[PDB]
């Protein structure tokens, strides 16, 4: 069957995958006890140094060259679907994750992340800034060819 989630990759271990090195949620998948993701972390830790990529683009070009599976965040995938029409997203937002900036204690923007950048969210500035950065047969035909050639031969014999 065609791939619909990582459960299909657990079923179909013929096509391998990879991820970014160091701490790109492998330790999260080490700590995760979901059975499909237990199998995912087991196979990609058996292939820890065997089949793995270091940068974001190195895994991207692997899908560009060969039939490679590539587990990453929705932001990079959403950016590269606008970049290339040959790429597709499989599955959904399974693992909830927050990309955010740390703050000092008592800094004036510490609560203005929660107010003024929340005012950017309420006015919607944070999403069209993202939008302005990235927009977001066969065998039967062969049988007909052979049958047509045989028909031409039968007509040319028949007269």
């Amino acid at each position: 069957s065609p791939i619909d989630s990582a459960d299909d990759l657990a079923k179909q271990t013929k096509i391998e995958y990879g991820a970014v090195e160091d701490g790109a949620t492998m330790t999260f998948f080490k700590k995760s006890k979901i059975s499909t993701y237990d199998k995912m972390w087991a196979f990609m830790s058996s292939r820890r140094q065997s089949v793995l990529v270091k940068s974001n683009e190195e895994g991207i070009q692997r899908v560009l060259t060969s039939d490679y599976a590539f587990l990453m965040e929705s932001t990079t995938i959403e950016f590269v679907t606008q970049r290339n029409c040959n790429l597709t997203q499989i599955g959904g937002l399974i693992d909830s994750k927050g990309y955010g900036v740390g703050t000092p204690m008592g800094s004036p923007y510490r609560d203005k992340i929660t107010i003024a950048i929340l005012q950017l969210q309420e006015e919607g500035k944070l999403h069209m800034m993202k939008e302005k950065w990235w927009r977001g047969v066969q065998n039967i035909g062969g049988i007909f060819i052979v049958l047509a050639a045989g028909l031409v031969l039968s007509v040319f014999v028949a007269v």
Partner: protein, 146 residues
């Protein structure tokens, strides 16, 4: 308290080579400083300049990674090592929430909410032509039939 000394202080921006829409601007003049990069973090730094107005040193880093600790080292390398070895003692870095970044980064509300998904190429899946002649069975049996 150091609240009387923390005011009117220069702010150090330590980010890495980010997402491909966040890079150096293409120009003949090497526009550096606060114009070193253009991106969504640069737009958020413009928003922080409307919020704070402090001087920002938008500059690259010598490591280029949000490194974690090792089993043979125990020290969280990379930008976490940058934010604990006094290059910027206030932990200011755009990254994702991890298991250990809750306690090694002082942290705030995350602006971006995202998931983890699978990226795959779209296949054509088309093999047209005379492939009854090109079965996985050998054509030796076909010329035997002939």
């Amino acid at each position: 308290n150091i609240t009387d000394s923390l005011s009117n202080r220069s702010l150090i921006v330590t980010t890495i080579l980010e997402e491909p829409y966040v890079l150096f601007k293409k120009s003949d003049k090497p526009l550096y400083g606060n114009d070193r990069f253009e991106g969504y973090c640069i737009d958020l730094l413009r928003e922080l300049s409307t919020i704070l107005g402090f001087t920002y040193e938008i500059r690259l880093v010598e490591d280029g990674k949000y490194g974690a600790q090792d089993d043979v080292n125990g020290q969280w390398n990379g930008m976490v090592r940058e934010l604990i070895d006094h290059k910027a003692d206030l932990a200011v870095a755009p990254l994702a929430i991890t298991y250990v970044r809750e306690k090694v980064i002082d942290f705030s509300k995350p602006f971006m909410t995202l998931g983890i998904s699978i990226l795959y190429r779209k296949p054509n899946g088309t093999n047209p032509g005379v492939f009854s002649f090109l079965n996985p069975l050998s054509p030796d049996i076909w010329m035997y039939v002939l």
